[PDB]
Design an enzyme around this catalytic site. Structure first.
Site, short mmCIF file in Angstrom:
data_model
loop_
_atom_site.label_atom_id
_atom_site.label_comp_id
_atom_site.label_asym_id
_atom_site.label_seq_id
_atom_site.Cartn_x
_atom_site.Cartn_y
_atom_site.Cartn_z
N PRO A 121 -39.77 11.31 1.19
CA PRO A 121 -39.76 10.79 2.55
C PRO A 121 -39.01 11.74 3.47
O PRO A 121 -38.05 12.38 3.03
CB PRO A 121 -38.99 9.48 2.40
CG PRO A 121 -39.31 9.01 1.02
CD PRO A 121 -39.57 10.25 0.19
N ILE A 122 -39.46 11.85 4.72
CA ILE A 122 -38.84 12.75 5.70
C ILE A 122 -38.49 11.94 6.94
O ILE A 122 -39.36 11.36 7.59
CB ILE A 122 -39.77 13.92 6.09
CG1 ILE A 122 -40.10 14.75 4.86
CG2 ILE A 122 -39.12 14.80 7.16
CD1 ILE A 122 -41.18 15.79 5.07
#
Lengths: 59, 58, 57, 59, 56, 58
Positions: free
Chosen positions: D1-2
């Site tokens: 996830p970013i």
């Protein structure tokens, strides 16, 4: 196409110019989009502003 | 390095896969960054969601 | 504070609800920012749209 | 996830380190994604660069 | 200039077209920028993907 | 609504304040969203950080 590239601070102007050129060419070849249509934004990150696994890049 | 690329809808999966590989290699080689550190996000835009000069790119 | 979180498609609505709550709490507590001011955007990525190391994830 | 987090300028390095750790852990447990896969970008905004209701956060 | 506008899903194409026109003119006039240089991206959010105060 | 506007560095504080006001009003009237709900982020770009056609735009 519009690309935004987040990179760590510290590169020279010349290095960033190369990045813009090489990425723009890559986008153009990949999508058969005219090079003149490609825009690239470089966004620099300070070392204390980028986290990996919850830890600072600076560390 | 993390790249987000906004493109108009209409490209094939094969083209988008090529885009990811070629852009990642370009970033890696330009910045002397490890290739596995490079992340690419493709964001597709519907034609009615992209404006140039105040007009739809339609 | 405004957070945009890119995640792979596939999570349930409730999981995404939890994500929003927990991230918002973390931002508020870390910065002593009003919780009510915290905004979170979830952006889902199709698997064919996310690359790691030049390869699809 | 970013995650990319826009915050107003003015926080200490220590506060931002805490922000990165806590947000990363929150993402990890919420999505059950390995913590080491989580990337967090802090983007600081100058007071004159953030608007609410058409008015500067400066005021 | 390049603007990305996050909005909740539910607006008509007509409204979004107006949004692009009006925002582009506002940017152009405010910055003395050539109108054709202005790009606007609309990014729609599903209601379950946008949080305020930790709640949907 | 949340807008992020990428612009080249060099504008005055006053110009950027005007940008925020006018863009916020444009968003509000276009979408019939309450003005108080509109947030605008200005992100400034150095000239060496913006490319058109693979060349610096400068």
């Amino acid at each position: 196409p519009i690309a935004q590239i987040h990179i760590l601070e510290g590169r020279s102007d010349e290095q960033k110019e190369t990045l813009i050129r090489e990425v723009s060419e890559a986008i153009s070849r990949s999508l058969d989009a005219p090079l003149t249509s490609v825009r690239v934004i470089i966004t620099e990150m300070a070392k204390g502003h980028f986290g990996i696994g919850g830890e600072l890049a600076s560390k």
